[PDB]
Ligand binder design. Structure first.
Ligand SMILES: Cn1nc(CC(=O)N2CC(C(N)=O)C2)c2ccccc21
Ligand SMILES: [Zn+2]
Length: 140
């Protein structure tokens, strides 16, 4: 589990969104595994606006933050899980690292701020849903 709290937005994995998230929906995209809902309080996270390929992510199944090198956001084939059939997921970045299903939501960050959240995993891989192209998170 986990979310990004920027401005009056809450960014979560679409597959982990709650009823309150769907009832206060701003935007969702199943191909990216992302959903954004509105919040009453302002958040403290800052979004990175950069092309970094190195950063650090939080792994809840290890209680640890790990430094990683990650690929550029792309269209990647992801195996079937409890939440999606086997399919192509867009705006996804891969790194070598530990991930279990419940690790979804952990933040990946670089020197500029939040880059994305854990979305996929398996066999020493971890996938991150990028948010750096969502410029509207910084306004309204
Ligand atoms: C974080 N992660 N995820 C999965 C499968 C899963 O629940 N999916 C893949 C997610 C998606 N965005 O399509 C939903 C896994 C399987 C072993 C290890 C780590 C893992
Ligand atoms: Zn950066």
């Amino acid at each position: 589990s986990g979310a990004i709290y920027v401005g009056n937005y809450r960014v979560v994995n679409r597959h982990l969104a709650t009823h309150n998230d769907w009832a206060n929906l701003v935007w969702e995209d199943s191909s990216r595994d992302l959903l954004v809902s509105s919040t009453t309080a302002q958040g403290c996270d800052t979004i990175a606006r950069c092309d970094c390929q190195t950063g650090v992510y939080y792994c809840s199944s290890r209680r640890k933050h790990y430094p990683v090198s990650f690929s550029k956001p792309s269209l990647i084939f992801v195996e079937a899980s409890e939440y999606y059939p086997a399919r192509y997921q867009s705006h996804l970045m891969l790194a070598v690292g530990h991930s279990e299903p419940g690790d979804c939501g952990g933040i990946l960050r670089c020197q500029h701020g939040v880059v994305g959240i854990v979305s996929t995993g398996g066999n020493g891989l971890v996938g991150f849903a990028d948010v750096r192209d969502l410029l509207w998170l910084d306004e309204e």
